[PDB]
Amino acid sequence: THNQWNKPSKPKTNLKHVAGAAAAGAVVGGLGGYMLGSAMSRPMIHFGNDWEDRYYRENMYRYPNQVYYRPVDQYSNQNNFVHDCVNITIKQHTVTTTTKGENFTETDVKMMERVVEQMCVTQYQKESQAYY
Amino acid sequence: THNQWNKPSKPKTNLKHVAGAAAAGAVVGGLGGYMLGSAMSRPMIHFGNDWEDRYYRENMYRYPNQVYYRPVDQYSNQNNFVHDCVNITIKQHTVTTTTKGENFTETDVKMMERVVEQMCVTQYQKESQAYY
Amino acid sequence: THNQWNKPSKPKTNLKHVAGAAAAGAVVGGLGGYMLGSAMSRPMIHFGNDWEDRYYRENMYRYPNQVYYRPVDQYSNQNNFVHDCVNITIKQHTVTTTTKGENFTETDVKMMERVVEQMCVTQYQKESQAYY
């Protein structure tokens, strides 16, 4: 006789963001930036009744991977990448307070002429010759 | 006779961000940046009843990986990368307070002429020759 | 007779950020930056009942990894990388207070002419010749 009696009370099980290869917010590029043979995930959760006998499972597995970066004649002049050019600030600030003033003049002058030429300029070639 | 009796009360099980290869927010590049044969994760959780007998499982596993970086004729002139050009500040600041003033003049002057030529400039070649 | 009786009360089990290869926020590049044969993780948690007999499992494993960096004719002129050019500040600052003042003049002059030429400039070649 085999008797299995199961009564789990208010279980909570949460799986979030389970993947073989996870690249949710990845930024990839640049002549073969990311190479991956294979990726596998197998989370297992057991909290019931389990009874097994005389079985034969999951035998003789092979996972052969070859990941080759093997170009023959590769010429790259400019290869670049940047993530962020962030929080760049230029200001002229004045705060003036006069609780009480009788006979006065206030002058506030601000000039910005040629403050910057290049601020966030990543890749360029100027007056340059390349021969192949 | 076999008896399995299971009554787990209010269990909480949380799996989050389980992957074989995790590159969620990765930045990758640059002529074969990231090379991975294989990546595997098998997290296992057991808090029930488990009973097993006369079994034969998970035998004879092979995980052969070859990761070769073998380019033959590779010419790279400029290869670069930067994460962030962040929090760059230029300012001219004045705070002025007068609580009481009779017969006075105030003059605030601020100039910015040519403060910066290049602020965040990553890769460039100027008046340069390359021969191949 | 086999009796298994299981009554775990309010267990909490948390797995977060479990991976074979973890590169969540990595920055990678540069002509074969990161090379890895294989990476595996198998975390296991047991707090139930577990009864096993006469079994044969997980035998005869092989994990052969070859990770070869072997370019034949590699020419790299400029290879570079920077993380951050952060928190760069140039400022001219004045705080003035006069609680009480009768007969006075205040002048405040700020100039920035040519403060910086290159602030965060990583890679460049200027008036340079390369022969191959």
Residue numbers in the entry:
A (entry chain B), B (entry chain A), C (entry chain C): 94 to 225
Task: Give the published text.
They are devoid of nucleic acid and composed principally or entirely of multichain fibrillar assemblies of misfolded, host-encoded prion protein (PrP), a glycosylphosphatidylinositol (GPI)-anchored cell surface glycoprotein containing two asparagine (N)-linked glycosylation sites. Prions propagate by means of seeded protein polymerization, which involves recruitment of PrP monomers to fibrillar assemblies followed by fragmentation of these elongating structures to generate more seeds. Different prion strains produce distinct clinicopathological phenotypes in the same inbred host and appear to be encoded by distinct misfolded PrP conformations and assembly states.
In this study, we present a 2.7 Å cryo-EM structure of PrP fibrils present in preparations of infectious RML mouse-adapted scrapie prions, the most commonly studied laboratory prion strain, purified to extremely high specific infectivity. In vitreous ice, we found that infectious prion rods are predominantly single-protofilament helical amyloid fibrils. We determined a 2.7 Å structure of the single RML protofilament and de novo built and refined an atomic model in the cryo-EM density based on mouse PrP sequence (residues T94-Y225). Considering longitudinal stacking of PrP monomers, the N- and C-terminal lobes of the chain are staggered along the amyloid fibril axis, so that each N-terminal lobe is co-planar with the C-terminal lobe of the consecutive rung. Our model suggests that there are 15 inter-chain β-sheets in the RML fibril. The C-terminal lobe of the RML protofilament continues to bind along the opposing strand in the hairpin structure, resulting in the C-terminal lobe being a single hairpin, while in the 263K fibril the chain pivots at residue Y218 to swing in the opposite direction and fold back on itself, forming a double hairpin structure.
